Amino acid sequence: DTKEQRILRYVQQNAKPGDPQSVLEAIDTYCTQKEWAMNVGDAKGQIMDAVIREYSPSLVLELGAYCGYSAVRMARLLQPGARLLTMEINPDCAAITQQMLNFAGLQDKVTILNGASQDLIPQLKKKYDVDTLDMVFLDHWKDRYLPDTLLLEKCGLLRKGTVLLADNVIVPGTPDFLAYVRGSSSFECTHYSSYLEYMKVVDGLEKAIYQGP
Numbered sequence: 001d002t003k004e005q006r007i008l009r010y011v012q013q014n015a016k017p018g019d020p021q022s023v024l025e026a027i028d029t030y031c032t033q034k035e036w037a038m039n040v041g042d043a044k045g046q047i048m049d050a051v052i053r054e055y056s057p058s059l060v061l062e063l064g065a066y067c068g069y070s071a072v073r074m075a076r077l078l079q080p081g082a083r084l085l086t087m088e089i090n091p092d093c094a095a096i097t098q099q100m101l102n103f104a105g106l107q108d109k110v111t112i113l114n115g116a117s118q119d120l121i122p123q124l125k126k127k128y129d130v131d132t133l134d135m136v137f138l139d140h141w142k143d144r145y146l147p148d149t150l151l152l153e154k155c156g157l158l159r160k161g162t163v164l165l166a167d168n169v170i171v172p173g174t175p176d177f178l179a180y181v182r183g184s185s186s187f188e189c190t191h192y193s194s195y196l197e198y199m200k201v202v203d204g205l206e207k208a209i210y211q212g213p
């Protein structure tokens with residue numbers, strides 16, 4: 001089996017169904033003690049929690065689901081009726097994420113889209129009945145942050161005030177995206193310094209609020 005399957009099995013063996021906090025703790029324990037994995041982690045997760053609570057988004061899009069850690073993190077803090085869409089290109093990870101959210105009891109708040117963000121983003125308005133997004137969490141391959149941001153704009157999915165929150169802007173880094181949003185009059189940017197998941201290595205999140213065309 002794979003690392004991702006081992007994470008899911010550990011959660012099933014150690015966490016409580018319907019208890020998102022126990023799911024997050026089980027994942028963080030496994031990934032601290034057994035095998036490192038690219039979950040956003042508790043340090044950056046706490047910053048995400050604070051941002052989610054501040055903005056109270058009705059509709060959030062996540063790019064990159066992996067095992068569902070960040071989806072559980074965000075979905076547990078959404079207000080009643082608010083929703084998360086998450087895109088995952090790896091079908092095995094899409095299935096693991098669905099099962100993780102099922103285990104956590106958050107399945108009615110989340111839709112997991114199996115496919116590449118660049119193929120799914122253009123279908124959000126027609127197939128998934130999206131008008132505009134309130135928040136986007138970018139946490140997929142780093143070379144897609146800028147192209148997908150530009151694609152979201154082209155597709156009419158951003159509104160004045162849409163909050164982009166980008167993981168890993170220091171490590172591994174996303175140089176084109178970070179330079180672009182910080183240089184653009186269409187974004188108001190703030191940097192939140194933190195640490196790489198499960199490591200004593202500096203990382204950070206960038207918040208970039210869309211200002212319109």
Ligand SMILES: Nc1ncnc2c1ncn2[C@@H]1O[C@H](CSCC[C@H](N)C(=O)O)[C@@H](O)[C@H]1O
Nearest residue numbers: 039040064066069070088089116117140141
């Ligand atoms: N173009 C794309 N569209 C959708 N998912 C993508 C993608 N490129 C990479 N990915 C996925 O992005 C994930 C990065 S890891 C995501 C971690 C997750 N947000 C968490 O914190 O828990 C991987 O599972 C990878 O398969």
Ligand SMILES: Oc1cc(-c2ccc(F)cc2)cc2nccnc12
Nearest residue numbers: 038039040064139140141168171172
């Ligand atoms: O949070 C992350 C961390 C890393 C990563 C990998 C290897 C290192 F050495 C350091 C950091 C990669 C990621 N890819 C996609 C989404 N999130 C990632």
Ligand SMILES: [Cl-]
Nearest residue numbers: 041042043198
């Ligand atoms: Cl951490």
Ligand SMILES: [Mg+2]
Nearest residue numbers: 040139167168
């Ligand atoms: Mg990340």
